[PDB]
Design an enzyme around this catalytic site. Sequence first.
Site, mmCIF file in Angstrom:
data_model
loop_
_atom_site.group_PDB
_atom_site.id
_atom_site.type_symbol
_atom_site.label_atom_id
_atom_site.label_comp_id
_atom_site.label_asym_id
_atom_site.label_seq_id
_atom_site.Cartn_x
_atom_site.Cartn_y
_atom_site.Cartn_z
ATOM 1 N N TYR A 183 0.937 -1.121 0.000
ATOM 2 C CA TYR A 183 0.000 0.000 0.000
ATOM 3 C C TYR A 183 0.987 1.182 0.000
ATOM 4 O O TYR A 183 1.165 1.853 -1.039
ATOM 5 C CB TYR A 183 -0.925 0.058 1.208
ATOM 6 C CG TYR A 183 -1.890 1.240 1.072
ATOM 7 C CD1 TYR A 183 -1.799 2.342 1.927
ATOM 8 C CD2 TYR A 183 -2.865 1.271 0.056
ATOM 9 C CE1 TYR A 183 -2.651 3.447 1.789
ATOM 10 C CE2 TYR A 183 -3.722 2.382 -0.106
ATOM 11 C CZ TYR A 183 -3.606 3.461 0.767
ATOM 12 O OH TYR A 183 -4.424 4.567 0.628
ATOM 13 N N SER A 190 -5.287 0.798 -5.107
ATOM 14 C CA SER A 190 -5.188 2.239 -4.814
ATOM 15 C C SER A 190 -3.989 2.710 -3.952
ATOM 16 O O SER A 190 -3.889 2.326 -2.798
ATOM 17 C CB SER A 190 -6.423 2.617 -4.063
ATOM 18 O OG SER A 190 -6.163 3.671 -3.175
ATOM 19 N N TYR A 191 -3.164 3.596 -4.460
ATOM 20 C CA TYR A 191 -1.907 4.055 -3.823
ATOM 21 C C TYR A 191 -1.023 2.853 -3.788
ATOM 22 O O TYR A 191 0.133 2.997 -3.898
ATOM 23 C CB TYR A 191 -1.911 4.641 -2.371
ATOM 24 C CG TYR A 191 -0.636 5.525 -2.172
ATOM 25 C CD1 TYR A 191 0.681 4.972 -2.244
ATOM 26 C CD2 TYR A 191 -0.744 6.919 -2.075
ATOM 27 C CE1 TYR A 191 1.845 5.794 -2.244
ATOM 28 C CE2 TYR A 191 0.376 7.737 -2.068
ATOM 29 C CZ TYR A 191 1.672 7.180 -2.158
ATOM 30 O OH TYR A 191 2.736 8.032 -2.199
ATOM 31 N N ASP A 199 -15.358 4.131 -11.141
ATOM 32 C CA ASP A 199 -14.559 4.509 -9.983
ATOM 33 C C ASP A 199 -14.653 6.033 -9.911
ATOM 34 O O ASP A 199 -14.122 6.748 -10.779
ATOM 35 C CB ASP A 199 -13.092 4.113 -10.173
ATOM 36 C CG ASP A 199 -12.298 4.156 -8.879
ATOM 37 O OD1 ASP A 199 -12.552 5.091 -8.053
ATOM 38 O OD2 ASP A 199 -11.410 3.263 -8.682
ATOM 39 N N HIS A 244 -14.294 2.263 -6.760
ATOM 40 C CA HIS A 244 -12.969 2.030 -6.201
ATOM 41 C C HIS A 244 -12.839 0.751 -5.365
ATOM 42 O O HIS A 244 -11.735 0.219 -5.219
ATOM 43 C CB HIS A 244 -12.514 3.234 -5.373
ATOM 44 C CG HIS A 244 -11.032 3.300 -5.186
ATOM 45 N ND1 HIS A 244 -10.154 3.242 -6.236
ATOM 46 C CD2 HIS A 244 -10.273 3.446 -4.072
ATOM 47 C CE1 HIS A 244 -8.916 3.358 -5.784
ATOM 48 N NE2 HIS A 244 -8.962 3.486 -4.472
HETATM 49 N N1 LIG Z 1 -8.524 9.128 -0.266
HETATM 50 C C1 LIG Z 1 -7.717 8.498 0.791
HETATM 51 C C2 LIG Z 1 -8.377 8.589 2.176
HETATM 52 C C3 LIG Z 1 -7.392 8.192 3.288
HETATM 53 O O1 LIG Z 1 -6.204 8.034 3.019
HETATM 54 N N2 LIG Z 1 -7.848 7.997 4.531
HETATM 55 C C4 LIG Z 1 -9.268 8.165 4.882
HETATM 56 C C5 LIG Z 1 -10.058 6.855 4.772
HETATM 57 C C6 LIG Z 1 -9.358 5.632 5.372
HETATM 58 N N3 LIG Z 1 -8.397 5.972 6.434
HETATM 59 C C7 LIG Z 1 -8.821 6.308 7.653
HETATM 60 O O2 LIG Z 1 -10.028 6.370 7.889
HETATM 61 C C8 LIG Z 1 -8.019 6.555 8.692
HETATM 62 C C9 LIG Z 1 -6.629 6.382 8.661
HETATM 63 C C10 LIG Z 1 -5.812 6.875 9.675
HETATM 64 C C11 LIG Z 1 -6.360 7.577 10.745
HETATM 65 C C12 LIG Z 1 -5.469 8.119 11.868
HETATM 66 O O3 LIG Z 1 -4.482 7.434 12.222
HETATM 67 O O4 LIG Z 1 -5.753 9.236 12.351
HETATM 68 C C13 LIG Z 1 -7.738 7.763 10.792
HETATM 69 C C14 LIG Z 1 -8.553 7.251 9.785
HETATM 70 C C15 LIG Z 1 -7.004 6.194 6.026
HETATM 71 C C16 LIG Z 1 -6.870 7.652 5.576
HETATM 72 C C17 LIG Z 1 -7.421 7.042 0.428
HETATM 73 C C18 LIG Z 1 -6.958 6.871 -1.020
HETATM 74 C C19 LIG Z 1 -5.641 7.210 -1.314
HETATM 75 C C20 LIG Z 1 -5.117 7.110 -2.600
HETATM 76 F F1 LIG Z 1 -3.830 7.463 -2.818
HETATM 77 C C21 LIG Z 1 -5.944 6.664 -3.630
HETATM 78 F F2 LIG Z 1 -5.509 6.538 -4.900
HETATM 79 C C22 LIG Z 1 -7.265 6.321 -3.350
HETATM 80 C C23 LIG Z 1 -7.766 6.415 -2.059
HETATM 81 F F3 LIG Z 1 -9.028 5.999 -1.831
#
Ligand SMILES: N[C@@H](CC(=O)N1CCCN(C(=O)c2ccc(C(=O)O)cc2)CC1)Cc1cc(F)c(F)cc1F
EC number: 3.4.14.5
Lengths: 728, 726
Positions: free
Chosen positions: A509, A592-593, A670, A702
């Site tokens: 990831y 994703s990522y 997506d 997604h």
């Molecule tokens: N949009 C991004 C959202 C994201 O990274 N987070 C929110 C949803 C899931 N996650 C969490 O809810 C979460 C993760 C960490 C924490 C914390 O330690 O404070 C709290 C919540 C991880 C961060 C995920 C994402 C990243 C990409 F690079 C991509 F291509 C697609 C994605 F959906």
Amino acid sequence: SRKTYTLTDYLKNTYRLKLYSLRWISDHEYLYKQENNILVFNAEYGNSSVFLENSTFDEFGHSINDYSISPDGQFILLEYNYVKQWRHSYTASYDIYDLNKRQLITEERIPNNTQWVTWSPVGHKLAYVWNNDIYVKIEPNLPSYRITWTGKEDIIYNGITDWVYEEEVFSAYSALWWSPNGTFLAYAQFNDTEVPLIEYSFYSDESLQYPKTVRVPYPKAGAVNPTVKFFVVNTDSLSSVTNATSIQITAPASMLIGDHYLCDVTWATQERISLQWLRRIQNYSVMDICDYDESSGRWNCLVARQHIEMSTTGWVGRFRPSEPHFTLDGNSFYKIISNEEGYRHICYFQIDKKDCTFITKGTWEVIGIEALTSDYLYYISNEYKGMPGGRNLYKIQLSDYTKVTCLSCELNPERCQYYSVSFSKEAKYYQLRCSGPGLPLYTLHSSVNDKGLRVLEDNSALDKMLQNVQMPSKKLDFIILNETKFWYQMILPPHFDKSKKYPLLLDVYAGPCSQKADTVFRLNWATYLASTENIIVASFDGRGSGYQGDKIMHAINRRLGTFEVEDQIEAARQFSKMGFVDNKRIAIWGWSYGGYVTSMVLGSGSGVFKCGIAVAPVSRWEYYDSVYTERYMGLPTPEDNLDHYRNSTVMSRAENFKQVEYLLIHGTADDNVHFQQSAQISKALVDVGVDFQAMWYTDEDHGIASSTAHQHIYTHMSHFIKQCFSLP
Amino acid sequence: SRKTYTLTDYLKNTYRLKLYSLRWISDHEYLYKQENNILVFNAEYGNSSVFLENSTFDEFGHSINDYSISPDGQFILLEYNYVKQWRHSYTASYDIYDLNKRQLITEERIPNNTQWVTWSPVGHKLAYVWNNDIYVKIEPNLPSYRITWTGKEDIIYNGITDWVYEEEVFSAYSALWWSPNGTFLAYAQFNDTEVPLIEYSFYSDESLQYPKTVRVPYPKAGAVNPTVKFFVVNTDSLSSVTNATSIQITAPASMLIGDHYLCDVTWATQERISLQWLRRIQNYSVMDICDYDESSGRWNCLVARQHIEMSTTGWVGRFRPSEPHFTLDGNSFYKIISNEEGYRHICYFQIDKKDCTFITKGTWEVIGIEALTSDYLYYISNEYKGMPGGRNLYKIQLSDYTKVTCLSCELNPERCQYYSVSFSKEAKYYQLRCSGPGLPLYTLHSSVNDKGLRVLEDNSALDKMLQNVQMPSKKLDFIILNETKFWYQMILPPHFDKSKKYPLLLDVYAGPCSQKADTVFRLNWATYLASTENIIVASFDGRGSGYQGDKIMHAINRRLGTFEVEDQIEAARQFSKMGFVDNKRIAIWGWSYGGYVTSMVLGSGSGVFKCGIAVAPVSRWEYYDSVYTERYMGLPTPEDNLDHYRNSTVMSRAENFKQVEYLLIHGTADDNVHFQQSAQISKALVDVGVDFQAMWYTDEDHGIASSTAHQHIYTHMSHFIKQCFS
Ligand SMILES: N[C@@H](CC(=O)N1CCCN(C(=O)c2ccc(C(=O)O)cc2)CC1)Cc1cc(F)c(F)cc1F
Ligand SMILES: *[C@@H]1O[C@H](CO)[C@@H](O[C@H]2O[C@H](CO)[C@@H](O[C@H]3O[C@H](CO)[C@@H](O)[C@H](O)[C@@H]3O)[C@H](O)[C@H]2NC(C)=O)[C@H](O)[C@H]1NC(C)=O
Ligand SMILES: N[C@@H](CC(=O)N1CCCN(C(=O)c2ccc(C(=O)O)cc2)CC1)Cc1cc(F)c(F)cc1F
Ligand SMILES: *[C@@H]1O[C@H](CO)[C@@H](O[C@@H]2O[C@H](CO)[C@@H](O)[C@H](O)[C@H]2NC(C)=O)[C@H](O)[C@H]1NC(C)=O
Ligand SMILES: *[C@@H]1O[C@H](CO)[C@@H](O[C@@H]2O[C@H](CO)[C@@H](O)[C@H](O)[C@H]2NC(C)=O)[C@H](O)[C@H]1NC(C)=O
Ligand SMILES: *[C@@H]1O[C@H](CO)[C@@H](O[C@@H]2O[C@H](CO)[C@@H](O)[C@H](O)[C@H]2NC(C)=O)[C@H](O)[C@H]1NC(C)=O
Ligand SMILES: *[C@@H]1O[C@H](CO)[C@@H](O[C@@H]2O[C@H](CO)[C@@H](O)[C@H](O)[C@H]2NC(C)=O)[C@H](O)[C@H]1NC(C)=O
Ligand SMILES: *[C@@H]1O[C@H](CO)[C@@H](O[C@@H]2O[C@H](CO)[C@@H](O)[C@H](O)[C@H]2NC(C)=O)[C@H](O)[C@H]1NC(C)=O
Ligand SMILES: *[C@@H]1O[C@H](CO)[C@@H](O)[C@H](O)[C@H]1NC(C)=O
Ligand SMILES: *[C@@H]1O[C@H](CO)[C@@H](O)[C@H](O)[C@H]1NC(C)=O
Ligand SMILES: *[C@@H]1O[C@H](CO)[C@@H](O)[C@H](O)[C@H]1NC(C)=O
Ligand SMILES: *[C@@H]1O[C@H](CO)[C@@H](O)[C@H](O)[C@H]1NC(C)=O
Ligand SMILES: *[C@@H]1O[C@H](CO)[C@@H](O)[C@H](O)[C@H]1NC(C)=O
Ligand SMILES: *[C@@H]1O[C@H](CO)[C@@H](O)[C@H](O)[C@H]1NC(C)=O
Ligand SMILES: *[C@@H]1O[C@H](CO)[C@@H](O)[C@H](O)[C@H]1NC(C)=O
Ligand SMILES: *[C@@H]1O[C@H](CO)[C@@H](O)[C@H](O)[C@H]1NC(C)=O
Ligand SMILES: *[C@@H]1O[C@H](CO)[C@@H](O)[C@H](O)[C@H]1NC(C)=O
Ligand SMILES: *[C@@H]1O[C@H](CO)[C@@H](O)[C@H](O)[C@H]1NC(C)=O
């Protein structure tokens, strides 16, 4: 002798983890949804009573997917006609069941296609959003009071988040916050007027003759962002006047100067709310503390009360500035912030004192604050045994920070090293949930003496079933690189023999603050690859990974697609030099990522990887959203960060794909990582004459998570991996 | 010992067929575009002269992709900035070069983004379409005269066709027809205001941050169709302040009663134009014959002058009613129509006589009328040797139908069995073009005594190269099924030995009136598969196939996806029972209609095929366009043929794909068979848990013809076939 954990076992869920989802309704009782009826339990003794019969709603005519009981226990909200939208949002129909008259309410019903509903925290008031406007019901059966009139589809959002706020800042569709006793209703409003639209075809059922074009206000990196306003309305004044006045609480000046975001709202008392704001260049945030002025009707936020939180090495917070936990009188609060060494610890603030005092410290981090009493503050951290992938519950004495006790570390050190927790209303009791490295274990405790009242669920049934199958094992350890230790995990085939050479699959990831090496017990695709195909499935947390301090986490600041990519290659090199890894059969995959890193790795020309699979990968940062992307990459402009935005695309590495076998997979609907991203990768590969494998998933998003698509993709990927590994 | 014809040979075009594209400019001379300069040739003797130097336009600053010389030789239209649209449409910039002043004209230039341009048939008048409106230039350097003002993007089309008329009825973008001496300019107007729009993403270069959504008015089966009107304007009655009056020619009445199409327009004389109209239920059409009324200014079409052409067993025409060929005085005409036995032959009509007389007959068909003089009528037919896949040029004496002469049959029966022809302006000379079974051969003839003047291009250079490579051979033969013979062809590996067992790939198209078994020489993917991989690549023409009579062609009427599919399965069974076919290695593949048939075969559960590849397939008829689909399927309504529309989808057979290896390929910007069609197949397969291989081609259309994607698709398909054939 005993079967293995097969692909069908994974796809058909033959071995299921049992859970214990309870819902605290007071400081002494909780509800336990039991598929058929919902019971109420007394935490102290364990005795229960039916709260709602399973047959209470038979001739409803609608399947109910969820319900919510009003805090005062007098009503039950029934949710049906559930239609999912994005990661958190959805629309649905609602009916309200009166519990004292045991009658469904039939007048002044909540409209169909309602976007969000929530009871007040006390009593039974209701606030819901319909057609992007807010409405409040003082009584379940009486007419609603409209609060906003500006609601406009894809344009103005009142009480609910637009796409980017839902996904990247609030992790929720809701954008309204009731005050503690229900008097005030606070809410945000988004103006997406100038936000560009991502457009893509949705094919729908075969009966649809013409595909539909879905269009969503979605700001890509550097594009025009939604703007936001914040309001507070007094719900108790709805009888007396028509058109209750929503009082606006505006910007801290240091935010108004340019593009910004509202990133946190937390009510402190019945008349005090705190708001955190964050500039678009996400390394500066401000917290405002606002009090209701009884003789003005306004909300004033004293400037001497504001608190600035910033970072010189990166962005603010793990994914955003952390939330405050106010004391009883709201005159002080605890908050997790990065200390002078880059480690996230709890510090104590006085509302009108600029400096805060850290109450925890060390080379480990506090994950989250879980509960606060006049006596103690409860929190989870990875302090135990120095393992960043472990999680335990601690309690620190507020009158003496020397008195720190670990409440879960010792309960069963062998089976449990990863805990989350759920406290009753006044923190009188708490349910501990252990998720690994052994089978999940749920227990209930009393806070008085932290005694363990009883075992709620121990998955003994799954345990009997699994001893009859050759399950894989899991090693969690570390390697040292340039004086820094990095953690990794390996799902090891049954009867692992380090004398033999096994093919290896790197499951990645590696986005910022990610953690793929932990102590959690999982039954997933890797379990099958290790158990049945005898493949070692490893993961590595390198630079950029979280929960180990900012030195490691911010190392990729403004440099996405560099160290986190190199560190995965290095890890594979190290693994191969462990002796039980077949050098000629190393693969990599990620979603994703993780799909992005996988593709960057595969196009690195490192020669380490034979093949790899990227599912819904990002391919160029300019294609992803502003809030997530800019947080790590700044803006895509000559002035700031455009050169690195243009230097970290998957497309520029097309040529190097001639050296590997690649499988590219993406859902056509997506809304998050747009099909666009993979469509550009495939075009660049075609342009340099590189052959590769592809699979699109019609109308999947997604998560490629519908029942049939989920099974189909893991089937298609299993075939690709075994072919690449010269095995069945 | 000698290499084979490889994949790279095919993809890089190492072996190139030579052509001889001439453009007749009179009854005695033709121009021959030489890739440098353009020369003019005298047909009689063969002497030439430069007509335009290759350096005449060096400092133009624009690459010129084509040109057109005015009929009077005074001007040259230069086309540059060519931007392709659909199969025939495109936009371009134009400049006019004066030949007597040897000067580029610089004033009143044709606009940029011009959609269509055409010299009058005589002189140097010009008619062009810009922003959907028609404009006329009496002189290259003078201001144009706007003829229409209603032109509106995607909405009103004047003088150009909309998507469905371009693809399915006129096979052209142009919708204007100049009268013989350039006096009148006739045109159609296509009103797409209720035609739904197909919408799809277009990703463009990597620099584009947000994908663009392309939207095209496109009527899918049973949807609202465009409407059409027909006008005629007199270009001689010009005006500085005056809108020239466009006189409209309305419908027969038997057409106005419902949805209909304008399907043919042919000028008969300086003042007589014929028009053919077809009802939406395409088994009834009417020809109108209209004359200009000098004292009315109107065009009247006498009812007693109309001709009705209908069918009781299918639609009208091969893909549409045939065009008429008028005599000098426009009082009579010849036209290919289906006779009482189902065979298409030439019928002779008198403009005011209801019945026509057939001048040819027999169990074979006239492919097309090529030229007409007072003396003879020249046509191409497959009469020779009774082979429907053969083509020869014949001439019939108009005064005595007993005098029929074959002009190409005997020239070189061994090398040439398939010809096309190009006559000079008054048919004094003709160039014959042989395309198989041997290498193409172009020759020039004089119509007087049909002497073969000389060999223009005989591909002797390719011949020398090919003798050094092990080329495959080609067998064209037939099998009998229920008393009817059906033709097939096999591309046979070099040194074919019927003692051995070869894997076999069925190459299918099989759409209505299609023909995949013929005598044409081709260098394609099949050549490589046979030459290098030793695979027999076969094609079969079963029920529904063309050029063999309505009994066979109309057999699938209202029943697409039935007999043409079964007949391909039956042919594969027969081939396997020939002895030199490995039963365990039979595959099938096709593009577009062939992709539909390939998928239906693979989903039939017959067990005959191991694997197959469908490229840009139709998957359900309700998704394809109205004109083509309804021609063979009627309307998708319960009162008509909705049941069969629903019974002939690929998706209903998802389950049976569990038995085969399937590769599904489609371009994401296909404006013809929308990506939607493959997106629904893939979704039905996933829903029943069937694994398969897939490949989308970003921004490619129905031709997946861009240089890099063409190479990529054939490379990917080749890996798939070899894997399937060990
Ligand atoms: N949009 C991004 C959202 C994201 O990274 N987070 C929110 C949803 C899931 N996650 C969490 O809810 C979460 C993760 C960490 C924490 C914390 O330690 O404070 C709290 C919540 C991880 C961060 C995920 C994402 C990243 C990409 F690079 C991509 F291509 C697609 C994605 F959906
Ligand atoms: C292309 O085809 C379009 C659809 O058929 C044409 O359109 C429309 O124009 C007519 C104008 O007469 C409208 O007629 C109604 O309104 C008048 C007055 O209100 C009534 O008197 C009459 O009885 C009708 O009720 C249509 O409503 C309108 N239909 C639409 C918008 O689809 C369009 O004009 C045509 N284009 C050209 C250049 O002719
Ligand atoms: N749209 C269709 C057009 C078509 O069939 N023709 C027009 C263009 C190419 N063809 C011809 O030009 C042509 C064919 C036959 C004749 C004749 O014998 O009179 C004349 C011209 C074949 C018919 C082709 C098509 C059919 C499908 F089913 C499909 F999925 C996609 C397509 F592009
Ligand atoms: C769990 O058991 C307790 C203890 O018996 C229940 O509390 C009693 O409720 C009855 C009412 O029927 C009273 O007569 C007693 O005086 C109560 N004693 C108390 C307060 O301990 C309790 O209701 C049960 N809870 C549930 C959820 O079933
Ligand atoms: C007070 O309520 C009113 C009436 O319900 C709201 O006014 C309407 O608001 C919309 C804008 O969303 C306008 O298009 C209408 O013209 C308004 N009519 C009025 C003034 O009644 C109004 O928004 C509410 N108060 C405020 C300041 O927002
Ligand atoms: C909920 O909180 C509100 C706001 O603090 C309380 O309302 C106030 O009550 C005090 C009386 O102690 C008055 O001085 C104020 O005038 C009230 N503010 C208003 C009108 O908004 C309310 O009492 C609380 N509810 C309960 C049941 O405790
Ligand atoms: C917050 O981020 C911005 C961008 O990284 C910082 O401002 C830039 O600082 C760099 C120095 O490394 C200069 O090259 C730019 O010209 C600055 N741009 C500006 C002022 O907009 C800013 O200093 C950061 N804040 C903190 C606390 O470090
Ligand atoms: C042209 O085709 C239509 C459609 O098949 C024919 O009309 C239909 O004929 C069938 C008989 O097979 C009836 O079941 C339908 O009720 C008829 N529908 C009508 C009247 O529209 C029509 O007869 C055909 N014309 C020719 C020349 O055969
Ligand atoms: C409903 O509750 C009864 C009472 O305990 C129980 O026996 C039954 O299994 C439940 N029905 C369902 C649908 O689970
Ligand atoms: C919702 O839609 C249903 C139709 O399914 C209708 O009966 C009802 O009146 C609507 N309103 C509410 C609040 O349910
Ligand atoms: C939204 O912003 C737009 C565009 O900048 C402006 O026209 C409009 O007044 C704003 N909407 C509201 C209700 O504030
Ligand atoms: C260690 O430092 C070297 C020298 O610059 C570099 O090549 C390597 O990638 C670094 N590894 C880590 C973990 O930073
Ligand atoms: C035409 O121009 C090309 C350009 O180099 C040249 O090679 C060729 O010889 C020229 N032919 C004639 C006949 O001028
Ligand atoms: C072609 O050659 C003939 C025969 O000598 C000559 O009469 C004729 O004029 C030439 N063509 C032209 C137009 O000069
Ligand atoms: C387009 O053509 C016009 C007409 O000749 C000319 O004046 C103009 O410069 C051209 N536009 C461009 C961008 O070259
Ligand atoms: C010609 O007629 C059209 C249609 O009404 C009109 O719009 C146009 O203005 C007329 N021509 C001129 C130049 O007035
Ligand atoms: C063209 O035809 C028209 C109409 O029949 C006639 O008036 C005119 O004279 C003809 N033009 C020439 C050059 O013969
Ligand atoms: C031949 O006859 C059989 C039985 O009637 C039939 O199923 C098959 O489709 C026929 N084939 C042709 C070409 O008619």
